[PDB]
């Protein structure tokens, strides 16, 4: 703004900055169908688990 | 930025030929005769001077 | 505006001349004005002709002092007068000099405001002499690693590149500055190169590819960049490397080592010739005129190491000469071949062949030796100039297609593992502590056993795999600079360890 002599064009798109703060819109996207996804694979995860268990004993 | 720039040396070279136009008009003048005197005198003064 | 304060700055210059030497133009002509005048006039002095145009004065005549302008003759016209400028031809020398192109007169073309300038000097300035010089013994890594292995560069030394016309000619010197960039960023002064480069006779454009690529590798930094373009008239060529010296002159009086590039000296030897034969001098040797040594070796022999009374000064300067047709034999590249202390010849079928840098290693000598050779690098390359000129002699053998017995192969297998590990990306420089162990991996015959195909491979990966494990041994390369006992133990158990990755 300082190199700038045309006037009133930084402190414009300075504000039109300070407008843009804000960011798109989103969040956490899944939390319920990674819990859903982790939920059926960590079942078959003690599936296996229970299972080769059994086996190493046996 | 660069417009600028750009405008402060489109400003200088308007004022050139302005420059051109006020040395038509001095030229024109009996300045032409005056500053003539006083440069006739001015050098009486100086290679006096030497 | 602006505008105000520079019409007050020219109305701010008055006060009339006494003129103490007139003379009247009357031949004038292919740029080469002769005046009718100047009784009092110094040799090489500058005169300004009256119309704004100055020119240096080289021919004394007992009738007319012969001008040659450095300007266009579309401003000078006939019977103008001229007025001494009573002092011989002068440059501003200064720190300010540093990130900033000018021209030969000291103007900035690149227009980042005037130049910051601690003095003035004198475009001809008397050698070093024997007395204040002392020997070399400051290496100079250009980060290529045949070069540095090869024809090792110092301080003080001048050292020819000679090859075939723009084989990335500019290019070979530029890697030297880039590398530069190690030392010169780092704040030890006793390593600081303040680099000078000096562009004689090229484009406006390519000379501003090559600022515009030292600012993209930001070494603008540390650069001063003298340019005489080609538009730009014959004398202020022929001037342009004398007053490039002196603003090297002015790091090497403050003791600061600099390195100056003189690129291209064959188009300076163009710039003597036309002006020579518009000066009328008899036509010399191949119609450079004779006296084009001399011309050249008062230029070259004002980069030296300077003795430790005159503080450790050194400019050291890598002249580049363009063989035409690589004709070694032409007048103008065997003057230069004399005044050097070096060759650093560049093959173009060796280009082709895809070494690049290229280098012909039998047409390429360092006179200056390994005296300005790192100690640790002596060490590891010790038979690596035996294993080349070996690999030469067999490679010669071998285009004969004799069933060569084992012990020729076994010079040839790892004479082409050398060839592919001496290759190097262009404007890519490598760090020399980590130029040591790809030598001492190669030397050690290592890569002689490692497939010709994967070295490019195996060579960034050795680094990688320095850089994860011994990178302790690589700090060590750097700190101690000579590989000790243990070092070379360390180095030589990790290569073994990465034989098979």
């Given at each position: 703004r300082s190199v700038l002599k045309n006037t009133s064009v930084i402190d414009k798109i300075e504000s039109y900055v300070k407008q843009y703060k804000p960011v798109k819109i989103d969040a956490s996207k899944q939390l319920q169908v990674i819990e859903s996804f982790e939920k059926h694979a960590m079942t078959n995860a003690k599936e296996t688990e229970s299972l080769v268990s059994k086996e190493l004993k046996d | 930025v660069r417009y600028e720039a750009s405008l402060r040396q489109l400003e200088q070279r308007q004022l050139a030929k302005s420059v051109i136009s006020r040395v038509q008009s001095e030229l024109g003048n009996p300045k032409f005769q005056e500053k003539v005197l006083q440069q006739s005198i001015s050098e009486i003064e100086q290679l006096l001077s030497k | 505006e602006v505008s105000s304060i520079l019409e007050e700055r020219i109305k701010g210059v008055s006060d009339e001349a006494n003129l103490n030497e007139t003379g009247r133009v009357l031949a004038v002509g292919d740029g080469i004005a002769r005046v009718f005048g100047l009784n009092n006039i110094q040799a090489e002095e500058l005169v300004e002709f009256s119309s704004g145009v100055k020119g240096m004065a080289l021919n004394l005549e007992p009738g007319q002092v012969g001008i040659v302008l450095?300007?266009?003759?579309?401003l000078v016209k006939e019977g103008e007068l001229v007025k001494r400028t009573g002092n011989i031809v002068d440059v501003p020398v200064g720190?300010?000099?540093?990130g900033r192109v000018v021209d030969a007169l000291g103007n900035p073309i690149d227009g980042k405001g005037p130049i910051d300038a601690a003095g003035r000097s004198r475009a001809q300035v008397k050698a070093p002499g024997i007395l204040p010089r002392r020997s070399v013994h400051e290496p100079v890594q250009t980060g290529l690693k045949a070069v540095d292995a090869l024809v090792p560069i110092g301080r003080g030394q001048r050292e020819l590149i000679i090859?075939?016309?723009?084989?990335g000619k500019t290019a070979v010197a530029l890697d030297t500055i880039l590398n530069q960039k190690r030392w010169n960023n780092g704040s030890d002064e006793s390593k600081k190169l303040y680099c000078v480069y000096v562009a004689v006779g090229q484009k406006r454009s390519t000379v501003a590819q090559l600022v515009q690529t030292l600012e993209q590798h930001?070494?603008?930094?540390y650069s001063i960049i003298v340019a005489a373009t080609a538009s730009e008239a014959a004398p202020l060529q022929y001037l342009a490397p004398f007053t490039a010296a002196s603003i090297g002159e002015w790091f090497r009086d403050n003791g600061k080592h600099a390195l100056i590039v003189y690129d291209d000296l064959s188009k300076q030897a163009v710039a003597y010739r036309q002006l020579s034969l518009l000066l009328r001098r008899p036509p010399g040797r191949e119609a450079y005129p004779g006296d084009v040594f001399y011309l050249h070796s008062r230029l070259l022999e004002r980069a030296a190491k300077l003795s430790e009374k005159e503080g450790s000064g050194s400019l050291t300067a890598l002249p580049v000469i363009e063989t035409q047709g690589g004709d070694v034999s032409a007048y103008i590249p065997t003057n230069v071949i004399s005044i050097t202390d070096g060759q650093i010849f560049l093959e173009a079928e060796l280009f082709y062949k895809?070494?690049?840098?290229?280098?012909?290693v039998g047409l390429?000598?360092?006179?200056?030796?390994?005296?300005?050779?790192v100690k640790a690098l002596k060490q590891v390359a010790g038979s690596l100039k035996l294993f080349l000129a070996q690999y030469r002699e067999v490679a010669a053998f071998a285009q004969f297609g004799s069933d060569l017995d084992a012990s020729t192969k076994q010079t040839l297998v790892r004479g082409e593992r050398l060839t592919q590990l001496l290759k190097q990306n262009q404007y890519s420089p490598l760090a020399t502590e980590e130029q040591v162990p790809l030598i001492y991996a190669g030397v050690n015959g290592h890569?002689?056993?490692?497939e010709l195909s994967r070295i490019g491979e195996f060579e960034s990966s050795f680094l990688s795999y320095l850089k994860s494990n011994h990178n302790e041994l690589l700090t060590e390369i750097r700190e101690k600079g000579e590989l000790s006992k243990e070092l070379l133990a360390s180095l030589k158990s990790a290569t073994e360890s990465f034989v098979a990755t």
């Open positions: - | - | 450095f300007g266009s003759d579309r720190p300010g000099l540093l090859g075939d016309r723009q084989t930001d070494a603008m930094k895809g070494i690049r840098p290229a280098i012909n390429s000598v360092s006179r200056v030796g390994s005296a300005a050779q890569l002689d056993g490692i």
